[model samples]
Target chain A: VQAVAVLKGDAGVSGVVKFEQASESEPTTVSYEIAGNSPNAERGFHIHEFGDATNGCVSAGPHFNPFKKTHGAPTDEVRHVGDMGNVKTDENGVAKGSFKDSLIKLIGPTSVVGRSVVIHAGQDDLGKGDTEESLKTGNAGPRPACGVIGLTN
Target chain B: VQAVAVLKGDAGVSGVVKFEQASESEPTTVSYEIAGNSPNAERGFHIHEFGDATNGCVSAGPHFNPFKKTHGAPTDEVRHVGDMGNVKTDENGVAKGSFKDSLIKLIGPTSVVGRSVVIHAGQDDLGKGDTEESLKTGNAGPRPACGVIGLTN
Candidate 1:
């Protein structure tokens, strides 16, 4: 499954998130390549709870934490299933990276097929703060970019 | 439970990671207030797999991944149980943040009372890359700080 992330609030930010199943010895992987961001800066990235784009990224709700856990990185044992963590842009304001995950799926209970992904204006601290916003959203700020995850052949 | 992170390799970096149980409405939060880092920079933060810091942070093995999960942010749902995410330092080289989590416990199959915490020289990517090292360690770079989680009154 994959989705082309379109820039919403920020015209300079856009990318794609790809999810592929791996072998039994390895975890599932998500590949993303983003362009037109702050050069040499980072942005908060994650899978929102809903796929509805009616009101733009703000309607996407919070991160998809199916296990009822807190927000965290993609490698943590207990993070929002939608939590993909941060992506760093290069000197050209472009960011590209991939991840192997055990939570995201194309099918079954934890599938992200109909959900949406978001790129925030700030870096996601991964919920490492005493502030209330940090615990829930990593204080990544507004959703400047977003897209819905769709089935891919 | 609390853990005082001692500097290793670099004497300028040291701090503490404290874990406590929260209310039924909230996940157990790990509060960490770390100072002495590269001012205005990020460091890889996590609870190591072992409590032994005899050989520095590396001796503690990889981040605590009891479910064999990957490395990620503290707010992510699919990250390592020990993945507390990253912390940023101020201009004075001080960093502090707290996170609520469900994967870690004081007493249970996933207790972190005897594990260790580590602070690396680089920022944690949360397994968002195609490389094996990114999947396993978030490409967080070297270990400059470490500590052991112990019961505290």
Candidate 2:
């Protein structure tokens, strides 16, 4: 299925995302390259449950949890289903990154198709108990930004 | 288990990521939050296979699909493991959000640890077969930006 948006909330952004099938029988490989400017600048990446864009992206609910786990790093073996990773910017405050993983199903009961992607103005702590997990990362700050997900193809 | 930077490349985002945990209960909710700003103002959300950050976030494999599936929306019942919904910005071109799901376990055998969240340019169409599922909002265009998921505390 393709990613499509239902509504445009107060949070806004502009960019491009692409995906490809690695093999006819393999999980479809995907890649993305976004370029634009946010109003707040500091934004975080998050995976919500629903695509309810009515309540300012808040109706999406907590991260996705097919495994029914907590919210933590990706290696915890027992964390939130939506705990993919984190996103950061540079001194210039520009966010740029490229990631790959098979934690989600594009066409399964656990698929994030109708869900939404949130961008916070703060940072994602990754459910740590200490100092930005210099060795762990993803433990930054608060929810300062947000965004929604939809099909583009 | 905070989020961390598992990517092997250094051409994408730069931040502190680690693996952490939220609690030690059933449905362990590992909470996470981070800050980011698209260098291009907007981007798409995606999951890769590994931390291949060298080739501009494209080295990562397709959505983590231990069970091969299609590239559909998050609501799909037979999709890739890495298939996540899209993230859209607001009028100011800024995006931010917080999400939680139970379909994935960040630390178990089927965890998404060490994975990455890649943002892209443009928008997701939500499988409209070229009709543009613009039923809601934030449903438009191609991917124009991108980012990755790292680890941090």
Candidate 3:
């Protein structure tokens, strides 16, 4: 089965959300999408290692680094398994799209069944492959805010 | 590695409580147990499928059915993997003790890595092999209350 969690900021800018989905069936057919208006002029979208709700946004931990690799654009040939791409708001500051990853397993060694979805307050350069951006968590500044992904109630 | 979420409550008498602990090593070898007491009464412990935290407590889903089997006592040799045994609180109205389970996994299949724990308000008769409550949720009485399980910080 699949489940999702929605997150809203104090500003009333809703839609920015998180999700958790798994399937005992067609495992590869599983998919996810998040659409919302960015609070900032531009924002970055990335998957986190852990969903540390107790620590606020900072506790989500680093990018989903199952392979223990550095972070880069979502399209990087070799990057963190949790390395999703950037999500920028439009001219009016809105961001939305879907992420369909086959790397996640319903039950296996690399299962990401329990992980966190993170939103940053910046944009991803998409692997201009920079050196100063740290390449670990993208240059995606502070978590701005975050949410925990869990099964639906 | 392994992790377990703990919860307990007895209706008309107390409120639901939640707690958690992660596996110490990569393979997650740890012993766990929970106790609840109310007027010399204690109940059995169990692992549920979901973390219904928003509604105070829901019966968590069913047992972590990765293998898709019926629910029964922990000693049933062929019961669901989520089955853990009973506990008895002391004279102080608090259930306490330790129970061990070896089937939990955090990085692979048959893992309860993302499931929640719940303590029922009834006692686990320990598969007395009686036909009446033989192959059920231990006939552990009502779900006085519940809680979601999560990985430790």
Candidate 4:
């Protein structure tokens, strides 16, 4: 599956997100490469609960947390399914990275298709901070960009 | 018809553009209100010749110049069909305005559907400038945002 990120609000960021099986026995792998057109800084990245972009990225809803888990690092067992972590931008303001995980399902109820991938304005603290927002959203600031996850051939 | 503007580059602009007939005998009227989330300033606005967004707004092609006319203001008879002019952002960074024109057709060969609406990074000079770019693109600078015109009803 693939998704195209669209800039939201005053954001100048945009890019593509791809999901595929890494191997026959391995977990589904997710990769994203977003053009960092804003400040050369870090930004939060995650999959949200919804995919609707009618009202821009905000309409996509909160993080995908079907298990009602706390926000944490991608490798954390108790982390939200949406918590994929942060992406760093180069001097030119581009964020590129990839990851593999078993939490994301392409089929059935937990499928990420039709959901949303959001790129926020601030770094996701990875639930390390004890702040309330940390436990909830990893202290990620406003969402500056997003894309609706879609099925691809 | 309706179109949703997707911001380009590091620009933080986004909004919706709507087109419809004011009355049965009236021409297609355009109403656009793009939120200013970037620097408080003016941006060029126009309808481009293509709807393809695969390569970002630039892929939308140049202004819809079916009449082979020079770039001019929306009210000018010799203006390109896409030359809608510039939209100004308020102090709070919001650009909102509307225009009505007879040149815009909803059903004929010049129909705007499947074309594109583009918002530029700089203000459109409306061809008053003596520069060559002025005559071609109204010196609208880089396109920071765009949206493909889509059927609404």
Candidate 5:
């Protein structure tokens, strides 16, 4: 089955994301079309612990780090389940695409169905930065957009 | 405080909804900027019982009729808190406006936070239709887009 989320933020940022999974062991497909972002910019994208996309994305709390792992790239084994790296926008300031990852599941306790997907104003270093906060949040800067993941019909 | 919701739906529909309230007794200030709708359309807009903007808008269930009242217009005394009536799109297929309403709240148990906003494909009958489903769903036809209401910073 699949899930979806509607993205919203100030500065005319708005869009949607779709999550699809075949099984618990299969990778989840993330599809999105987020617009009104910075032109030709890279924005951090991750699943948060709460579904508080309405509270300026800060109310969503931290990332989905149930595994107690450090921040890393989407391909890194040490990365949090919330990690999805960054989404690059086009010259029109629209970010739209589809990618698959293994960590973000749609079923079970760790499922992100009830969580939020946050898009940062800046790019995620993907744990490449050496700062302490970098390892915790990738120093992704302000969260400008977010949405709650919900079950689709 | 205020809240916001990001919107998403097929056929290029995406936007945001902001909810502002001074107190529980005061009316909520609803502001929206939804684009990618049909030109000169009168889509049904309402707060749903659930926050499911994915799996198709149906996953959000029926209108938020906590009082078990019938479907009515936003000005109707017997209307549900979820009732917001139709959102008229411009020639560019965009729905943008700000309005004040007392039925939709942002505080307490009946709050719209954690709920959802759904935009239908047709106009809302507002209980004026003589049919049964018309009074139930306003004959709004299919739900094309939706977004979750969350607490804002």
Candidate 6:
């Protein structure tokens, strides 16, 4: 199964991400092309718990934590399913890349579709920072860009 | 399992829709509360094929038709999975109600999450219009508001 998300936000933040699950037991592929960001900057990218953008990204709530796990690195055994770590922008202010995640799913339980993907203004500390928000949101600051993850036809 | 969406648009079109599935074999409950519409208006509401809002509502493409079926009423056996007929607004320009649909799913192959729910500026003809666009889009004039469907925590 496959799914996708098209993100849009203020200050020219716009991009697209694709989610593909070849099988129920396989990893989901996440590919993205984001532009109109701070040049050569680092930003926290994750799947928030809600799809509601009514109050903007803030309405999306915290990171998706279906397993009741603490905020951690994407590869950590005890990390939330929404954790995908940070994404760094290029010299031209664009963040683009792809990764295969074992935790994010397109079908079955813990599926990522219908959630929100958020990119913050600050870089994620990846659970190594001293601040309290670090363990919660990697200290990710205000969300400048976000969009709902949806099923692709 | 449940999913939700929050929609916002021009002319005061704002609302929320919730999608809930009690089980894989059960019907999905769709509850909505919309406001800021033209008073006493009848509008077309459906799940578009895409989650994309990149080009505004037009980017969402057509009604989700995974089975390649023609547009029909919500209860029609041959209708597209996205077809849900029309919603009439109250005198105060609001549409508040709920319905259960068997074809829409929260999980499995035909899940509606990550797609979009759109409220058109015109009423859905329910495939009864004489024009070709009627059969295609119910001749729904324009999309005033739409938002992506997301899974609830």
- Judging by lDDT against the true structure, name the best candidate: 6
Q: How should the candidates be ordered by lDDT, best one leading?
A: 6, 5, 4, 1, 3, 2
Q: For residues B13-102, what per-residue lDDT tens digits would candidate 4 score against the true structure?
A: 677777876444577777777875455676788988765555768777888888798999888878998888888888887887787878
Q: Rank order by DockQ, top first?
A: 6, 5, 3, 4, 2, 1
Q: Which docking category, incorrect, acceptable, medium or high, applies to candidate 1?
A: incorrect
Model 5 lDDT per residue over A1-153, tens place: 577777777768888998899888998999999998899988898888777553477888898898999998999989999999999999999999999998899876577765788888888999899899899899998888787876554
Stretches of candidate 4 exceeding 4 Å from the true structure: A1-153, B1-9, B22-25, B37-40
Model 4, A1-153: lDDT tens digits are: 332333344567777777775334457778777885455776788988765556667777778999999999988888998888888888888877787888876544565655678888888999999898899889998887876554333
Clashing pairs in 3: A90-A94, B1-B26, B35-B95, B36-B95, B89-B95, B116-B149
Off by over 4 Å in 2: A1-43, A130-145, B1-153
Could you give candidate 3's per-residue lDDT for residues A25-120 as a string of tens digits? 343222333344464455666667654444555656777776876666655677777666776566555666665555544345554445566666
Model 1 alpha-carbon drift over 4 Å, by segment: A1-10, A22-26, B1-153
User: Using Cα atoms with residue i matched to residue i, what is each candidate's TM-score against the true structure?
Assistant: 0.47, 0.40, 0.62, 0.50, 0.59, 0.85
- For candidate 5, write residues B1-153 as lDDT tens digits: 577777776658888888899998999999999988899988898988877654567778899987999999999998888999999999999999999998788776676665788888889999899999877889888887887775444
- For candidate 2, lDDT tens digit of each residue in A1-153? 333222223334333333333433345333433333343354446566654433455555667777766667655676665665555555544456655546654554455544555554555566665653422324533333333343332
| Candidate that beats the other on DockQ, 2 or 3, i.e. the better one | 3
Q: How many Å off is the CA of A95 in candidate 1?
A: 0.4
Chain A TM-score values for every predicted structure, listed in order: 0.89, 0.67, 0.74, 0.88, 0.95, 0.96
Q: What are the per-residue Cα lDDT tens digits for candidate 1 across A4-65?
A: 33334446677766666643334567787878788898789888876544455776778887
Off by over 4 Å in 6: A10-12, A75-78, B9-12, B66-68, B75-78
Docking class of 6: medium
What DockQ results do all the predictions give, each relative to the true complex?
0.01, 0.03, 0.16, 0.04, 0.16, 0.62
* Model 1 residue A24 CA deviation in Å: 8.9
User: Distance from true position, residue A13, model 6, in Å?
Assistant: 3.4
TM-score attained by chain A of model 5: 0.95
Candidate order by TM-score, decreasing, is: 6, 3, 5, 4, 1, 2
Query: What C-alpha lDDT do the candidate models reach, one value each?
Result: 0.69, 0.44, 0.54, 0.73, 0.83, 0.85
